């Protein structure tokens, strides 16, 4: 309903995609070169390899990137004797984290006295103290100093930018303050990638080779997202819930940025379309459960969801039964569309993993109906279950022929350490972040209420609190990240990681939570409207 209109109409020439994708194919050999130069050190490679991170064009280069860094990684404590350049030893610090690799916060040693503990020196290093602002994010739960760089490289970048010498470069001016409101590894890849393409221009010196593939690859990235989110109009649209059903919410755009944040590449682009399917379909269910629906409603549509089926009839009333109906349909068509690419069974899952999201939905509701406020603790063991991550993990791995069914389903139901810490961040994100839209519907019931209710704070400081609950379980995300590798594909890894970074982008705002609508609009039409000049 309205962005809905426009891309149902917007004009996508595949004539303009084809040569895209042609200069694309034509530049990458020159790329690629520049990676295996015998001439470039191992720094050298890191460096490219950041720059090709920040620029989002570092997939097109994965085989040869991750080899790259094995061999690295294992000459790492060589590499590093004597560097003692703050921006070097941080992009290294990014570089082999986010591959896996967990480079040793004792890097950081050589920039620290004997306290305080970050030198004060260290603050003609603009640029440095940038990377290092960015690195903190990329912490381990043990890792205090993170916190404590952070905070250094925030307060001395704030008062450069206030005022003296900062106005003499604008172009890195700017870039600082994007980054100090939203750190890069708080921002998902594309975002990040689209405001560095941006930055990279305004550099002296940078390489016109590389600007050029980033523009080029941002194009045709964006290309897939309008034609995906032309398709998954069309499809809403012939659906047709909104004439069946009062109350259906907007949530395209939205339920797209559900497939965008965990994959932007453009070979996840089938990928992305069906979590945006799936996601668009379950939202209809989880307003279902609704405070206003009866007790025997919703018994019955928790016992349809448990047994998978059309009612029989010994059932109830027609809103309901067209809410059960579409969702059995729309599921039994995207498993029609996955069979012959022989990911049927993935799809299977969504269902089955959603039975024991239904039943807590069904406490949810209880809480709701009666005006019951449980404690924040005995809401968080129902919370939990209903924030689903197992499930929407499934959903992106079903678009994925790079992933194993049977590896991928099997760590899923293993119960992962991680999948857990994205349950916490997404539940306490999102509750705190809908908390005044959960409070005129009846939805009593939710972690910043229950807290509120549980230690007689306030609404500010509850935030707070549950704020620190989410950054602990973000530091377990980056650790399971890192420690996983080699054991779980890291196709399936980078998604755990994207989920937290997509949780980031929609809710945080400050020290947060917010609405994730007035976020998007930030960023719509960057994203999915204008392309970048060429
Ligand atoms: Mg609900
Ligand atoms: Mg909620």
Known sequence: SLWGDHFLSVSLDRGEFDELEREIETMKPLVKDMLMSSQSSDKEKIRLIHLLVSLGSSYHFDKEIQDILKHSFTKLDDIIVGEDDLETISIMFEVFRLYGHKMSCDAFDRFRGEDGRFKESLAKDVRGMLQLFEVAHLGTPSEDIMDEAS??????????????????????????????????????????????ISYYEQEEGHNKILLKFAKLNFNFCQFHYIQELKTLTKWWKDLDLASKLPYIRDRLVESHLGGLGPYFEPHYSLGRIIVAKIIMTMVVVDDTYDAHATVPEVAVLTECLQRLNIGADDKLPDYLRTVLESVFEVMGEIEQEMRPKGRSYGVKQVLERFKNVAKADKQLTEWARTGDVPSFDEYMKVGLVTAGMDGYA??????????????????????????????????????????????????????????????????????????????????????????????????????????????????????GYSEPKGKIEHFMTSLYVHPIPL
């Open 394 to 511: 499934g959903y992106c791995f079903i678009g994925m022929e790079d992933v194993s069914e049977k590896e991928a389903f099997e760590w899923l139901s293993s119960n992962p350490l991680i999948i857990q810490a994205l349950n916490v961040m997404f539940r306490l994100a999102n509750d705190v972040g809908t908390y005044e839209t959960e409070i005129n519907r009846g939805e009593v019931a939710n972690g910043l209420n229950c807290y509120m209710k549980q230690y007689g704070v306030t609404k500010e400081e509850a935030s707070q609190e549950l704020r620190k609950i989410y950054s602990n379980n973000k530091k377990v995300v980056m650790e399971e990240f890192m420690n996983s590798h080699d054991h779980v594909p890291r196709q399936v890894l980078l998604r755990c990681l994207n989920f937290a970074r997509l949780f980031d982008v929609m809710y945080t705002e400050g020290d």
């Open 151 to 196: 905070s250094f490289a925030q307060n001395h970048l704030d008062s450069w930018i206030g005022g003296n010498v900062s106005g003499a470069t604008p172009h890195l001016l700017k870039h600082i303050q994007n980054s100090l409101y939203i750190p890069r590894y708080c921002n998902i890849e594309v975002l990040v990638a689209r405001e560095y």
